[PDB]
Each structure stands twice: as C-alpha cells, then as structure tokens.
Enzyme design. Structure first.
Site, PDB file in Angstrom:
ATOM      1  N   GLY A   1      36.255  25.948  22.642  1.00  0.00           N
ATOM      2  CA  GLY A   1      36.920  25.909  23.933  1.00  0.00           C
ATOM      3  C   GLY A   1      36.475  26.900  24.993  1.00  0.00           C
TER       4      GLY A   1
ATOM      5  N   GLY B   1      35.955  22.775  17.603  1.00  0.00           N
ATOM      6  CA  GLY B   1      35.099  22.897  18.765  1.00  0.00           C
ATOM      7  C   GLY B   1      34.964  24.330  19.226  1.00  0.00           C
TER       8      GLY B   1
ATOM      9  N   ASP C   1      47.499  24.645  25.810  1.00  0.00           N
ATOM     10  CA  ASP C   1      47.043  25.798  26.598  1.00  0.00           C
ATOM     11  C   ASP C   1      47.890  26.251  27.789  1.00  0.00           C
ATOM     12  OD1 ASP C   1      43.425  25.302  26.172  1.00  0.00           O
ATOM     13  OD2 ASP C   1      45.009  25.925  24.791  1.00  0.00           O
TER      14      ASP C   1
ATOM     15  N   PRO D   1      41.631  16.273  30.572  1.00  0.00           N
ATOM     16  CA  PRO D   1      41.828  15.372  29.437  1.00  0.00           C
ATOM     17  C   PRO D   1      41.661  16.037  28.081  1.00  0.00           C
ATOM     18  CG  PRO D   1      40.699  14.227  31.192  1.00  0.00           C
ATOM     19  CD  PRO D   1      40.697  15.690  31.558  1.00  0.00           C
TER      20      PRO D   1
ATOM     21  N   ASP E   1      44.710  24.872  34.191  1.00  0.00           N
ATOM     22  CA  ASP E   1      43.460  24.238  33.798  1.00  0.00           C
ATOM     23  C   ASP E   1      43.631  22.934  33.033  1.00  0.00           C
ATOM     24  OD1 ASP E   1      40.605  24.141  33.746  1.00  0.00           O
ATOM     25  OD2 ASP E   1      40.655  24.837  31.663  1.00  0.00           O
TER      26      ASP E   1
HETATM   27  N1  LIG Z   1      46.192  21.846  18.768  1.00  0.00           N
HETATM   28  C1  LIG Z   1      45.098  21.136  18.339  1.00  0.00           C
HETATM   29  O1  LIG Z   1      45.232  20.328  17.440  1.00  0.00           O
HETATM   30  C2  LIG Z   1      43.852  21.356  18.901  1.00  0.00           C
HETATM   31  C3  LIG Z   1      43.572  22.623  19.510  1.00  0.00           C
HETATM   32  C4  LIG Z   1      42.293  22.903  20.097  1.00  0.00           C
HETATM   33  N2  LIG Z   1      42.094  24.059  20.638  1.00  0.00           N
HETATM   34  O2  LIG Z   1      41.342  24.187  21.718  1.00  0.00           O
HETATM   35  O3  LIG Z   1      42.678  25.139  20.153  1.00  0.00           O
HETATM   36  C5  LIG Z   1      41.275  21.876  20.058  1.00  0.00           C
HETATM   37 CL1  LIG Z   1      39.691  22.094  20.709  1.00  0.00          CL
HETATM   38  C6  LIG Z   1      41.557  20.632  19.465  1.00  0.00           C
HETATM   39  C7  LIG Z   1      42.827  20.342  18.887  1.00  0.00           C
HETATM   40  N3  LIG Z   1      43.053  19.181  18.348  1.00  0.00           N
HETATM   41  C8  LIG Z   1      42.368  17.925  18.774  1.00  0.00           C
HETATM   42  C9  LIG Z   1      41.173  17.660  17.883  1.00  0.00           C
HETATM   43  C10 LIG Z   1      41.284  17.805  16.474  1.00  0.00           C
HETATM   44  C11 LIG Z   1      40.159  17.564  15.643  1.00  0.00           C
HETATM   45  F1  LIG Z   1      40.267  17.705  14.342  1.00  0.00           F
HETATM   46  C12 LIG Z   1      38.917  17.177  16.215  1.00  0.00           C
HETATM   47  F2  LIG Z   1      37.867  16.951  15.431  1.00  0.00           F
HETATM   48  C13 LIG Z   1      38.801  17.034  17.625  1.00  0.00           C
HETATM   49  F3  LIG Z   1      37.647  16.681  18.162  1.00  0.00           F
HETATM   50  C14 LIG Z   1      39.929  17.276  18.459  1.00  0.00           C
END
Ligand SMILES: NC(=O)c1cc([N+](=O)[O-])c(Cl)cc1NCc1cc(F)c(F)c(F)c1
Length: 294
Positions: free
Chosen positions: A13, A11, A141, A126, A123
C-alpha cells in the site's frame, strides 16, 4: 512473527507492505499492515489508537495498533477483495445498477458515520473499498491520512493515484473538509457506472485540467474564492462545462442529479453524506448478492 503467521503478501500500500496473516492464538485471519521510518511520532500512535473505537458495518475494523520493537503494525479485519479488482472482473458486463446503488448507499452510510465522528478519509479510491460475499462494502484506511498529514507518496517509489482527488486539494488548499470524501466517492460512483475512470489524470495539472474540461473551468460564480486558492493561476485555460448526460451515460436523472451534487466545485455546496442518503436515487435501494470469484 512474534504472534502472527504470515499467510501471504497481499500487496504494498501507500503506507507500507500488507500481509494476510493468521493469529496463531485466536486463529483469526487478518490483514497486517507494516507502517513505514526512524522515529514514528507518538502523536500519530495516539490518534490512530482512537480509530480503534470506530465501529460501523461499513468501516473496516482496526483491530490493533502494535508499537513494538519500535515498529508500527496495523491489524485490520480481513476482506477478500477490493472494488478495483471487482470492477475489473465486471468490466465486460458492468456491475448491475442495483449493486452499484447498494454499494454507494453503504459507502455513504460509512462516510456519514466517520464524518459525524470528525474523521476524514482523504484518500478514497476503489482499492480502499473492500467487499465480501454477503453484499457488504467497507471503507478501509479512514483517519490514517490525518494521523500522518500528507507524506506525499507511498514509501518506496510507486505512482500515487490522483484520479479521486478533490479540486480544492489540487488547488493547494491546506484545510481538507468532509467534502473531499464526497468528491472521491462521486468519482467512484461514475466509474462503476461507465466502467472507465472519470478523471484519469497523469499529473497534478493533468488531473486538474481533466476536471476542468468536463465540469468547466471554475470561476467566482460557481466557486466563491477559487481565484484566491494557493495554486490557482489566472492563466488556467477556460473550458466550458459538459452535460452529465454525456459524462455518465446511460445513468438515469436520479443518478445524474446525485452525482452532480457530489461533484460541485465549491466544497460548501457539495452534498453531505447524510443528505445524499436521502436523495431520491436511493428510493428503491436493496442489498443484492454480488458474484464474487475468490
Ligand atoms: N483489510 C483487508 O482485508 C485488506 C487490507 C489491505 N491493506 O492495505 O491493509 C489490503 Cl492491500 C487488502 C485487504 N484485503 C483485500 C485483498 C485481500 C487479498 F487476500 C488479496 F489477495 C487482495 F488482492 C486484496
């Protein structure tokens, strides 16, 4: 990638783009977040580096801080799904109470750990709560906000979510306390229960007024000092408080009691994560297996 192998773009962020990547060496799968611009305060990299030492089962591990080619990358342990997606997937039937309780309990343990180490999240939402097939939930985070004060928005035109912001932040207070995280978690607890955001504000003032319409416009009685907050205006409409029985039905009194303590206006009266863990609501807490479809 000099060392990684981008699998996909997870994504984008609030601090940059995120990728699922495989460390071609270790072979581990991680989340790689590219931080936003043309300098990067060395003060930040030091503070961030400190976060690498934080280890707790309910906190997403920060594996590495990479400052190379004058760019900032954060390497995090990977989890397959976030609570926002899970709540959407569970909208028809609702997340079972035992699982809601387990998740809330785990998040409070995570917050109690962070707060005892003088680390605030600031922050919580969900989207920042990650879950796995084992029934675990982890905070993602923590500490990044302070190591960056408040950059207002994400980085490239994206509507910042105010739904989980504590009233003191909305009223312009410059000094955040651990209480802001308890407020956000209270909002999330309510949303898991009702399957609808508690305070879905569309602007900072709409956010504040939605809070006031439900909990009553705060005054010096319930929040000593509120009328002296930077953005407080005597012209704020005065709304009467609603009953929690109407706010998070059909949650039982143990749950309503805990939620009410997490949503007190005065940051000083708001329950601590440590104290919340001892609340009667958790007397029968267990660790259920969620139904995750990946
Ligand atoms: N630490 C993490 O694992 C992680 C980190 C961030 N991020 O902000 O550094 C984000 Cl956004 C999503 C994450 N996983 C959830 C996730 C994994 C997927 F593979 C996916 F497709 C999805 F929608 C959500």
């Amino acid at each position: 990638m000099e060392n990684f192998q981008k699998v996909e773009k997870i994504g984008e962020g609030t601090y940059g783009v995120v990728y699922k990547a495989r460390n071609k060496l270790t072979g581990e799968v991680v989340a790689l977040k590219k931080i936003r611009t043309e300098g990067v305060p060395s003060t930040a990299i030091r503070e961030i580096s400190l976060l690498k030492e934080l280890n707790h089962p309910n906190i997403v591990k920060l594996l590495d801080v990479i400052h190379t080619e004058n760019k900032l990358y954060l390497v995090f342990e990977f989890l397959h799904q976030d609570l926002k997606k899970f709540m959407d997937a569970s909208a028809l039937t609702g997340i079972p109470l035992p699982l809601i309780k387990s998740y809330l309990f785990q998040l409070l343990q995570g917050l109690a750990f962070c707060h005892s180490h003088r680390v605030l999240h600031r922050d919580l939402k969900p989207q920042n709560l990650l879950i796995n097939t084992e029934g675990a939930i982890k905070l993602a985070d923590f500490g990044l906000a302070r190591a960056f004060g408040v950059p207002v928005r994400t980085y490239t035109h994206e509507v910042v979510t105010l739904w989980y912001r504590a009233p003191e932040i909305l009223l312009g207070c410059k000094y955040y306390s651990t209480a802001v995280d308890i407020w956000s978690l209270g909002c999330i607890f309510a949303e898991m229960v009702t399957r609808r955001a508690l305070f879905p504000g569309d602007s900072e003032i709409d956010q504040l007024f939605r809070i006031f319409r439900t909990l009553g416009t705060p005054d010096e009685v319930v929040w000593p000092g509120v009328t002296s907050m930077p953005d407080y205006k005597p012209s704020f409409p005065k709304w009467a408080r609603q009953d929690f029985s109407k706010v998070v039905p059909p949650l039982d009194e143990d749950g309503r009691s805990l939620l009410s303590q997490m949503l007190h206006y005065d940051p000083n009266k708001r329950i601590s994560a440590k104290a919340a863990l001892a609340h009667p609501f958790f007397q029968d807490v267990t660790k259920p297996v969620p139904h995750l479809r990946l």
